[PDB]
Amino acid sequence: SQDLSEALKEATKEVHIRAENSEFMRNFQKGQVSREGFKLVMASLYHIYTALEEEIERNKQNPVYAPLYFPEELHRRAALEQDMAFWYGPHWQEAIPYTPATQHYVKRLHEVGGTHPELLVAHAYTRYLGDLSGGQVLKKIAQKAMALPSSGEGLAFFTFPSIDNPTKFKQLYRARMNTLEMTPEVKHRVTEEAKTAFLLNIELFEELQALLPSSFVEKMKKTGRNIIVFYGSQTGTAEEFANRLSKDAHRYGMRGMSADPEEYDLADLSSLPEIDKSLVVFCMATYGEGDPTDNAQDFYDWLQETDVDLTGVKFAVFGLGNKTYEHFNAMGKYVDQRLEQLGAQRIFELGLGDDDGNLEEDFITWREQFWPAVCEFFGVEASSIRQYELVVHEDMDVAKVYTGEMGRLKSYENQKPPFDAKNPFLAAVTANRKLNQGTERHLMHLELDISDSKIRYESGDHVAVYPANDSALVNQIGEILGADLDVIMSLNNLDEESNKKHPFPCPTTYRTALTYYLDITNPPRTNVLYELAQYASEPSEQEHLHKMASSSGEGKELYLSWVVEARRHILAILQDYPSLRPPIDHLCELLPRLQARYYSIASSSKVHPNSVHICAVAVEYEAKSGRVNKGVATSWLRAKEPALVPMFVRKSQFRLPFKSTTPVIMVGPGTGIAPFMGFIQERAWLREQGKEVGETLLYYGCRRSDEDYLYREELARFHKDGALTQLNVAFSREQAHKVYVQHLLKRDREHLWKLIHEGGAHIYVCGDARNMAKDVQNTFYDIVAEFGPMEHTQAVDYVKKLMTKGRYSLDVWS
Numbered sequence: 001s002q003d004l005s006e007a008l009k010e011a012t013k014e015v016h017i018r019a020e021n022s023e024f025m026r027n028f029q030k031g032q033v034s035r036e037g038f039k040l041v042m043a044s045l046y047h048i049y050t051a052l053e054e055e056i057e058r059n060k061q062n063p064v065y066a067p068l069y070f071p072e073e074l075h076r077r078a079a080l081e082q083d084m085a086f087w088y089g090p091h092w093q094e095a096i097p098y099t100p101a102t103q104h105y106v107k108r109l110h111e112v113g114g115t116h117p118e119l120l121v122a123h124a125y126t127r128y129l130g131d132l133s134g135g136q137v138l139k140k141i142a143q144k145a146m147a148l149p150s151s152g153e154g155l156a157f158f159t160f161p162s163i164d165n166p167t168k169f170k171q172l173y174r175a176r177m178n179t180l181e182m183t184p185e186v187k188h189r190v191t192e193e194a195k196t197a198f199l200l201n202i203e204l205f206e207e208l209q210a211l212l213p214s215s216f217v218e219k220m221k222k223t224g225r226n227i228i229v230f231y232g233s234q235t236g237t238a239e240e241f242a243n244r245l246s247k248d249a250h251r252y253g254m255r256g257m258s259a260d261p262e263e264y265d266l267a268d269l270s271s272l273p274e275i276d277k278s279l280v281v282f283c284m285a286t287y288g289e290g291d292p293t294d295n296a297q298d299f300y301d302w303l304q305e306t307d308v309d310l311t312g313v314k315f316a317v318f319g320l321g322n323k324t325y326e327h328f329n330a331m332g333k334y335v336d337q338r339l340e341q342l343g344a345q346r347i348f349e350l351g352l353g354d355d356d357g358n359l360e361e362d363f364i365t366w367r368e369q370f371w372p373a374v375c376e377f378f379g380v381e382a383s384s385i386r387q388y389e390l391v392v393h394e395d396m397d398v399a400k401v402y403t404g405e406m407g408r409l410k411s412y413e414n415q416k417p418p419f420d421a422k423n424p425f426l427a428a429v430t431a432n433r434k435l436n437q438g439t440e441r442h443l444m445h446l447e448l449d450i451s452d453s454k455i456r457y458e459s460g461d462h463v464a465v466y467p468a469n470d471s472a473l474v475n476q477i478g479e480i481l482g483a484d485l486d487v488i489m490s491l492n493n494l495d496e497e498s499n500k501k502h503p504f505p506c507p508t509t510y511r512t513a514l515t516y517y518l519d520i521t522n523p524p525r526t527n528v529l530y531e532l533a534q535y536a537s538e539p540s541e542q543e544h545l546h547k548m549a550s551s552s553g554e555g556k557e558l559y560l561s562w563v564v565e566a567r568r569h570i571l572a573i574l575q576d577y578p579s580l581r582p583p584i585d586h587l588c589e590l591l592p593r594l595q596a597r598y599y600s601i602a603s604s605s606k607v608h609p610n611s612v613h614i615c616a617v618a619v620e621y622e623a624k625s626g627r628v629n630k631g632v633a634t635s636w637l638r639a640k641e642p643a644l645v646p647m648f649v650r651k652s653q654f655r656l657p658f659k660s661t662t663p664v665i666m667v668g669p670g671t672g673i674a675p676f677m678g679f680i681q682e683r684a685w686l687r688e689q690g691k692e693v694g695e696t697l698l699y700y701g702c703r704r705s706d707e708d709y710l711y712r713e714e715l716a717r718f719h720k721d722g723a724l725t726q727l728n729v730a731f732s733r734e735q736a737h738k739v740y741v742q743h744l745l746k747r748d749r750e751h752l753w754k755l756i757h758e759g760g761a762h763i764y765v766c767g768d769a770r771n772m773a774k775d776v777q778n779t780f781y782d783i784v785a786e787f788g789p790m791e792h793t794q795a796v797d798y799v800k801k802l803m804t805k806g807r808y809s810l811d812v813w814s
């Protein structure tokens with residue numbers, strides 16, 4: 001094509017098909033990779049990436065490569081050295097081979113980096129863009145096939161801790177590629193060199209291949225079990241889940257086993273109701289185009305043409321899927337919907353695990369609320385064995401007790417770089433003023449001083465903050481529970497081979513754990529209500545707590561109405577149910593951890609290098625339970641007057657264009673103006689350095705001009721200086737019909753189209769506003785359809801292509 005990214009994708013089509021059809025890569029896809037062949041590819045890759053990054057460092061400021069310099073995000077030499085130490089021992093430096101094909105690849109890399117740097121892109125593309133695609137699945141396949149530690153040793157090459165979204169980063173990288181100015185002949189040479197790089201990889205793979213040459217019903221009867229968990233897996237995740245489920249079975253009054261459904265004629269589901277309180281669980285991953293895992297293919301086929309009467313059978317299904325596919329959890333949904341068709345009844349709601357997000361968290365939630373539903377269905381209300389043991393330290397020094405820090409002991413006082421999620425830096429609150437002019441809501445602008453933290457950030461990055469619960473809540477809970485909060489103690493997991501030895505940093509007091517480590521504000525999950533039912537004196541409230549553990553029936557109605565919809569925290573539950581007098585250690589075992597909260601950085605590191613600006617709206621509402629609830633992080637930050645805040649910075653892919661001449665179209669209603677401020681700052685800064693800056697358009701939205709017009713004065717000053725080219729503000733509540741930013745974009749359709757088409761502008765969409773991103777998206781669809789004469793389908797294809805080339809970026813949240 002014309003844009004370099006599309007030209008590279010099209011030019012390297014056949015060679016990519018060929019590379020992934022090589023015998024070595026095909027054996028890899030099928031899970032048949034050997035430790036020796038894996039050591040071979042990894043050593044070759046060490047040599048290759050050493051050469052590649054050597055030449056990258058050599059040309060990191062050459063204009064023909066400069067926009068692609070992403071050392072912190074992409075480079076591999078460090079991880080490859082870690083993996084060499086893993087796979088070849090301490091003296092790997094002389095133990096790793098250097099095959100002729102690897103030397104050919106390295107020689108070509110050095111030729112390019114030395115005498116033809118204009119082609120270096122073609123090689124980075126072939127490697128880095130590849131590592132951010134198939135590599136994510138290859139890492140799982142390796143973990144399972146070779147049996148590596150779950151800690152990630154040996155597969156550090158496949159891990160990008162600075163890239164939280166490889167799709168968005170690939171968009172950013174394509175954008176940086178298309179910025180490269182080059183003549184058409186040079187573009188053709190670059191595509192040919194990308195073909196050459198693919199061919200080098202192909203012949204490397206070829207050379208490395210050259211260097212290799214009893215029915216479960218009666219079974220459960222004789223083994224004495226009532227639970228069986230079939231796993232439909234390909235890369236071991238569903239197997240792991242099924243094994244952990246059947247492991248929880250034995251420690252709950254019941255007794256289960258995790259089995260493979262492949263070698264069992266599941267006609268033994270009709271023979272299963274003849275086991276006392278029997279139930280079967282299915283952890284089903286889905287592949288292909290809504291196709292079952294191979295180990296369940298037979299099973300799937302069996303459910304097609306069958307009529308086995310499965311009356312009185314108890315089942316539950318958890319599905320493993322990915323929201324990016326458009327057959328989301330087809331296998332799990334099919335098994336769930338179909339077992340009820342055959343006669344069985346659902347005990348717990350079907351789980352829908354997303355792999356785009358945190359699949360582990362989805363599964364932990366599902367299991368956590370599943371086990372109570374089982375214990376409350378069959379009525380086997382024995383009340384289960386604990387998981388953490390209380391050990392009070394009545395005489396113990398204070399320099400050994402956790403006082404709220406997150407990582408190592410006394411890490412909040414002995415601050416040493418680097419600072420990240422496990423070692424947050426305590427930034428000094430320099431400013432905390434009100435942006436909101438009215439009184440509808442309180443919107444605040446904080447500034448955090450990070451002078452000598454050595455923390456780097458860019459406009460568009462995010463800042464995460466570890467908050468503290470309101471101390472009045474902690475005191476009230478400690479009062480109504482009738483316990484002492486300053487008691488130094490510990491909770492030790494007696495699941496001995498679970499290296500998760502505590503629920504939170506220990507030893508510490510109950511006050512400290514309630515203040516910094518636990519989430520005492522979000523509505524409680526079903527599991528804590530079940531485990532609290534045994535502490536209710538009155539059988540009315542005990543029976544309420546029990547029934548609230550039923551996923552089916554009016555128990556779910558009660559749970560959703562009185563807890564979720566009413567938004568009752570733990571204190572509200574302890575208040576309205578005065579029968580509840582549980583201990584404090586069991587409560588600290590049942591409550592979920594206090595999560596950090598993310599905010600869009602509202603400053604540019606080029607004008608505010610030692611400061612990070614946050615723009616937030618304080619959460620505070622009258623819940624339907626009567627009480628007035630407060631947002632943890634926003635209330636905690638609101639009280640901060642210039643006063644430390646534990647924070648860290650997470651890289652995003654929201655980035656201004658490399659060329660200062662490129663125009664930007666920012667759209668951000670409400671708090672979504674947060675990053676754009678930074679943008680504008682940096683943009684203004686580029687004008688002050690004497691650089692030529694393109695158009696900078698802002699489409700902001702608020703209610704009233706005198707109510708919540710955030711940064712009105714600063715935006716006005718930016719506009720009058722020329723830094724902010726257009727200030728298009730849509731006031732939603734200044735007449736009878738509401739005016740949103742969609743209408744302002746629709747208004748300037750002609751100029752916007754000339755910016756996008758002729759100027760090659762970047763579009764940014766940001767903010768909380770629900771259903772707003774899709775409205776802006778449809779607006780741009782219509783603009784492109786109208787002004788560049790197109791069918792609606794051609795226009796949506798055009799806009800999607802823009803998203804691929806990193807010219808339509810999103811940063812939405814809730």
Ligand SMILES: Cc1cc2nc3c(=O)[nH]c(=O)nc-3n(C[C@H](O)[C@H](O)[C@H](O)COP(=O)(O)OP(=O)(O)OC[C@H]3O[C@@H](n4cnc5c(N)ncnc54)[C@H](O)[C@@H]3O)c2cc1C
Pocket residue numbers: 462521567597598599600601615616617618619621622623630631632633634635671672674812813814
């Ligand atoms: C990448 C990312 C970027 C973000 N950037 C920003 C930003 O720039 N500015 C900003 O303000 N926030 C931002 N957020 C959201 C932020 O992380 C918090 O969710 C938000 O600030 C509130 O945090 P909190 O701890 O004070 O409230 P929490 O303790 O987390 O609880 C809030 C909950 O209260 C509930 N709730 C809210 N209103 C009502 C209501 N009327 N009635 C009933 N229930 C209600 C909701 O269920 C809500 O989830 C971002 C989030 C992400 C993931």
Ligand code: HEM
Pocket residue numbers: 005008009016019020025028029125126127128129130131133134138170198201
């Ligand atoms: C294990 C075999 C492989 C599989 C399953 C695989 C799969 C994929 C997939 C699904 C994509 C699309 C991602 C996207 O469009 O955003 C992709 C793109 C890509 N792959 Fe592969 N791949 C394999 C082997 C390789 C190899 C060996 C290389 C190079 C050494 C490579 C280089 C690339 C590149 C550069 C892209 C990006 C194309 C673009 O968007 O411009 N792949 N691959």
Ligand SMILES: Cc1cc2nc3c(=O)[nH]c(=O)nc-3n(C[C@H](O)[C@H](O)[C@H](O)COP(=O)(O)O)c2cc1C
Pocket residue numbers: 137140232233234235236237238239285286287288289290291293320321322323325326327328329330355359
């Ligand atoms: C080739 C491939 C195809 C996939 N297809 C789908 C799909 O169609 N629908 C879906 O929801 N998930 C799909 N997924 C997501 C998987 O279900 C997800 O990765 C799941 O965690 C796999 O579990 P496992 O490791 O036990 O095999 C697919 C994954 C791969 C690798």
